[PDB]
Amino acid sequence: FIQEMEHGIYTDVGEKGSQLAAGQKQRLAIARALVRDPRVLILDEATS
Amino acid sequence: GASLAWLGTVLLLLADWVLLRTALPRIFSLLVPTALPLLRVWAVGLSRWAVLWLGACGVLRATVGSKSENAGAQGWLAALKPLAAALGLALPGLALFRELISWGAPGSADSTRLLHWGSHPTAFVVSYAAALPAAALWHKLGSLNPVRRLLGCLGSETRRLSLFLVLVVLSSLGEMAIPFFTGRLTDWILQDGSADTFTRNLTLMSILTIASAVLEFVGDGIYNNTMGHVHSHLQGEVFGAVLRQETEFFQQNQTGNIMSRVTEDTSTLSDSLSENLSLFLWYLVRGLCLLGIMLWGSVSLTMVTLITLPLLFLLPKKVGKWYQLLEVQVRESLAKSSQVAIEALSAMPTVRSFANEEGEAQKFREKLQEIKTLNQKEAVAYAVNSWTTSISCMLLKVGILYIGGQLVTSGAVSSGNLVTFVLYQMQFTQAVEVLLSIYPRVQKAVGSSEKIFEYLDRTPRCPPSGLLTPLHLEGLVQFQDVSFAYPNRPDVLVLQGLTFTLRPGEVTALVGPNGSGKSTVAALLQNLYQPTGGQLLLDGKPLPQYEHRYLHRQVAAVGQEPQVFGRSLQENIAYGLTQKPTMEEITAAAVKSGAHSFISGLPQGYDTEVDEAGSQLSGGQRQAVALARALIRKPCVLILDDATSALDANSQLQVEQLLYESPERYSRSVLLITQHLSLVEQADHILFLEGGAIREGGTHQQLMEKKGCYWAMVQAPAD
Numbered sequence: 001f002i003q004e005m006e007h008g009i010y011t012d013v014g015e016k017g018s019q020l021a022a023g024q025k026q027r028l029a030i031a032r033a034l035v036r037d038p039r040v041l042i043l044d045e046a047t048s
Numbered sequence: 049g050a051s052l053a054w055l056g057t058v059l060l061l062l063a064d065w066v067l068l069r070t071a072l073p074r075i076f077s078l079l080v081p082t083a084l085p086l087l088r089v090w091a092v093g094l095s096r097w098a099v100l101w102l103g104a105c106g107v108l109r110a111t112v113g114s115k116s117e118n119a120g121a122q123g124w125l126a127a128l129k130p131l132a133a134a135l136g137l138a139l140p141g142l143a144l145f146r147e148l149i150s151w152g153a154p155g156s157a158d159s160t161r162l163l164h165w166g167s168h169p170t171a172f173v174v175s176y177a178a179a180l181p182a183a184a185l186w187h188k189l190g191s192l193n194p195v196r197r198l199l200g201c202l203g204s205e206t207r208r209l210s211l212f213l214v215l216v217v218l219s220s221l222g223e224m225a226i227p228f229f230t231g232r233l234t235d236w237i238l239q240d241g242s243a244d245t246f247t248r249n250l251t252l253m254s255i256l257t258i259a260s261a262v263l264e265f266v267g268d269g270i271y272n273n274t275m276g277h278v279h280s281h282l283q284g285e286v287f288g289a290v291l292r293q294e295t296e297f298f299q300q301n302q303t304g305n306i307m308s309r310v311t312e313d314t315s316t317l318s319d320s321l322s323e324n325l326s327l328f329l330w331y332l333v334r335g336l337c338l339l340g341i342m343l344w345g346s347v348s349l350t351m352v353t354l355i356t357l358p359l360l361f362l363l364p365k366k367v368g369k370w371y372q373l374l375e376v377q378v379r380e381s382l383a384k385s386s387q388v389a390i391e392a393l394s395a396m397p398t399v400r401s402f403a404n405e406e407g408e409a410q411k412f413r414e415k416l417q418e419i420k421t422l423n424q425k426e427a428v429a430y431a432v433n434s435w436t437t438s439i440s441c442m443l444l445k446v447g448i449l450y451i452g453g454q455l456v457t458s459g460a461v462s463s464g465n466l467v468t469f470v471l472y473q474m475q476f477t478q479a480v481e482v483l484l485s486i487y488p489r490v491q492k493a494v495g496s497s498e499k500i501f502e503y504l505d506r507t508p509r510c511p512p513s514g515l516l517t518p519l520h521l522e523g524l525v526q527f528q529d530v531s532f533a534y535p536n537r538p539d540v541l542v543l544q545g546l547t548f549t550l551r552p553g554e555v556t557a558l559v560g561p562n563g564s565g566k567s568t569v570a571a572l573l574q575n576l577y578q579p580t581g582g583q584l585l586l587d588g589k590p591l592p593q594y595e596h597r598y599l600h601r602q603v604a605a606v607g608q609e610p611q612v613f614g615r616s617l618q619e620n621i622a623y624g625l626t627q628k629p630t631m632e633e634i635t636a637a638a639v640k641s642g643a644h645s646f647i648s649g650l651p652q653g654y655d656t657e658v659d660e661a662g663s664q665l666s667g668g669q670r671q672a673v674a675l676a677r678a679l680i681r682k683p684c685v686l687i688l689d690d691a692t693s694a695l696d697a698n699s700q701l702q703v704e705q706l707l708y709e710s711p712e713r714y715s716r717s718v719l720l721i722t723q724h725l726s727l728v729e730q731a732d733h734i735l736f737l738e739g740g741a742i743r744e745g746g747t748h749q750q751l752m753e754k755k756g757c758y759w760a761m762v763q764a765p766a767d
């Protein structure tokens with residue numbers, strides 16, 4: 001869904017990610033968490 | 049037309065110069081005794097005015113007969129009457145005023161020697177030259193910007209600012225009555241043996257000072273109360289206007305920005321208004337008093353002073369726009385800083401969980417750097433404007449001094465009157481400097497109020513609320529070829545050709561992958577957005593035809609991430625009801641939604657104040673509170689937007705009972721957006737909204753038989 005946006009990864013998401021679906025927000029949060037290559041990963045209702 | 053009018057005007061001028069110049073003084077000297085020269089002058093002036101007015105009326109009547117030529121000639125002729133009035137009544141009025149001023153020091157030479165001035169060609173030319181500009185100004189005035197918008201706020205408060213002005217004038221009169229009754233200080237204080245003059249003057253001065261102080265006290269109280277009312281009213285109006293806008297206006301303008309505009313721009317505007325308006329009115333009154341004194345001193349030099357004020361006000365008129373733009377930029381930067389701060393302070397767990405306090409600080413510092421670069425220009429402009437005002441008033445004083453010296457050398461003005469005029473003209477120029485300093489502040493206030501007045505004058509891009517409040521509403525919703533594209537990205541269609549119907553007593557599940565458009569359907573059914581195509585009917589009529597509050601108590605929705613305000617749970621459950629419900633209704637709703645179990649266990653029960661973000665309520669409890677809030681209205685249409693995601697087993701059983709078992713199900717239609725197939729399986733209708741279009745529909749058995757998208761979704765985990 002990122003490539004379907006107007007400007008790809010440079011598209012403004014809105015305040016509190018308002019211009020997004022809930023699943024898109026969860027996927028973006030997962031991507032943010034994974035970009036760090038964390039040693040410990042805590043998925044708190046990451047797939048609700 | 050024009051030629052006849054010009055010929056008539058020339059004939060009138062010649063007649064006035066020939067006959068009225070000489071014949072009238074002789075006639076009124078023979079008719080009137082010599083003991084009343086003022087009476088002779090008044091009679092001659094009245095006769096001249098009458099003759100000229102009759103001539104002007106005749107010329108106007110003659111010109112009205114023909115209408116073939118332009119109307120400019122008539123416009124010019126319109127000033128013949130005031131010009132004639134000035135010509136006739138300039139001399140007698142001055143003579144009467146001079147006689148009334150003093151009965152022992154006549155200026156003479158006008159009232160007396162009446163024919164010696166009426167027939168005097170020099171005096172005739174002087175009267176014409178004096179009457180021409182006064183008549184021109186009067187005619188120009190009679191024939192008859194963001195600052196007007198700024199000052200329109202003081203509309204309903206005129207009756208109180210008028211009292212303020214009256215009290216200011218009374219205080220000024222009391223201030224000036226001291227020298228006119230007690231004289232100069234040394235006249236009584238220095239005299240040795242003063243018993244009936246020192247005490248009298250001291251008591252009179254003290255009484256006048258006390259009266260002026262009390263008048264100023266009352267006026268200031270009235271003014272401050274009025275300004276407080278203005279401030280409150282303006283803030284309320286701005287907030288209401290902001291809330292009257294459309295749903296996307298709040299996606300273009302962010303929360304902190306709007307909050308800064310509503311709370312901070314208005315406050316600065318009102319403070320500037322109050323300070324500068326009080327200053328302006330006070331200095332206007334005192335400058336008028338100083339002008340009166342100056343006129344008493346030397347009329348010619350006072351007119352010369354009044355001629356040159358526009359020269360002093362030229363430059364401010366040029367730089368006002370620069371001031372406005374500067375202040376607009378300053379307000380915008382402050383709003384951006386407010387947005388950064390609001391966004392950071394509302395998600396502190398997220399900021400700290402990623403160790404990004406430094407980044408938020410850096411963003412705030414960047415906004416503050418913008419504001420700093422603007423403040424540098426503010427300060428430099430302040431210094432330069434101060435220099436300009438000081439130099440302007442200094443040059444005014446110097447020029448008046450030079451002209452007064454020339455006049456005193458030429459013998460036109462006596463030395464004492466010249467000194468008095470100079471001493472009061474210095475104060476007048478100081479007041480002029482104060483007003484010049486006020487002007488940039490007004491320009492900056494315009495700049496500050498630009499955005500809030502844009503809010504106030506903005507036209508919401510949404511239909512107005514209707515008037516339909518039927519006593520009984522069935523709850524039958526109909527989407528007919530409804531299509532929608534979000535206003536920010538109208539080129540993409542989120543919904544394409546949705547056609548379906550919600551009937552009371554039935555449940556219609558809306559299933560599909562993420563981004564399909566289900567929450568968009570819920571938002572359309574709540575009247576948050578208007579469909580671009582098709583039509584959406586509630587009980588056979590469009591949603592905009594229903595009243596706002598009626599519609600929003602007849603259609604209730606539990607959102608995907610329900611919002612809970614910072615109030616007691618009792619106030620959250622009943623949020624928006626005109627009549628506050630009784631605790632029996634609130635507890636019944638909580639029982640229906642399953643929120644009674646945990647609310648009752650709270651130490652304070654339903655009076656438990658909720659945090660701003662609702663962090664006290666865990667996931668599932670907040671959804672139960674939102675469901676109770678939806679259900680307390682007894683709506684005809686009930687939307688559940690992924691409302692069972694966080695509910696535990698007990699609340700899931702409660703919602704299942706509410707949907708498919710409760711006796712009230714027959715009085716409402718439910719749109720059940722969900723992904724829990726347990727509730728979808730019992731749904732009377734199922735709609736697979738994939739990609740914004742309903743790929744399939746029907747009951748559970750039919751979709752399972754079709755082995756289409758629904759079957760694939762159901763058996764995906766089993767693969």
Ligand SMILES: Nc1ncnc2c1ncn2[C@@H]1O[C@H](COP(=O)(O)OP(=O)(O)OP(=O)(O)O)[C@@H](O)[C@H]1O
Nearest residue numbers: 019020021022023534561562563564565566567568
């Ligand atoms: N305010 C908005 N402005 C622009 N596009 C938006 C806005 N809100 C949502 N969208 C987009 O509209 C599409 C549909 O969003 P919507 O929330 O209606 O889908 P959904 O199927 O209900 O999502 P989910 O299953 O994740 O809850 C998505 O592509 C989303 O990014």
Ligand SMILES: [Mg+2]
Nearest residue numbers: 022566567608
């Ligand atoms: Mg959704």
